Design a protein around this nucleic acid. Structure first.
Length: 105
DNA sequence: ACCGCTGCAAGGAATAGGATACTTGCGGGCTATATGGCGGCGAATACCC
């Protein structure tokens, strides 16, 4: 498994695309339609910034990954994930959240 | 005390011979598209509920 992939909890395909400069990823993406870490195609990024030339940041590549990682709190995420793992559901999400919590702790 | 003369250079036709500009191949010096191997296993999709 890829430690980045499941620490940040993003499918490895999308990090593969981002880290070789063929897409865009939002960093904070607040005060707008976008979420924390949506992926964008080049044209999608151009269109989004056109309609939303406000301050939402969407970077491209290693710098974006670094900012996204450095912009996270570990133990708080651990609390949220253990609360969610409390139940709903112990079928495969049980295994997934146990692994992610193991890495985070 | 004036002049036509001789004579002494300047520019044409025929030969030998070195200097010297020109040409060339190199030697080292440098930079920058496969197609007869399986087996196990675990993660990542697919699927049809």
């Amino acid at each position: 498994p890829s430690r980045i992939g499941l620490l940040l909890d993003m499918p490895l395909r999308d990090i593969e695309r981002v880290l070789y400069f063929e897409s865009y990823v939002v960093i904070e993406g607040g005060m707008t339609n976008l979420e924390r870490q949506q992926i964008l195609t080049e044209e999608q990024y151009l269109d989004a910034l056109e309609e939303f030339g406000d301050e939402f940041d969407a970077k491209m590549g290693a710098e974006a990954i670094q900012a996204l990682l450095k912009s996270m709190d570990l133990e708080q995420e651990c609390e949220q994930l253990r609360e969610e793992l409390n139940e709903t559901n112990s079928e495969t999400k049980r295994k997934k959240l146990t692994k992610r919590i193991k890495l985070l702790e």
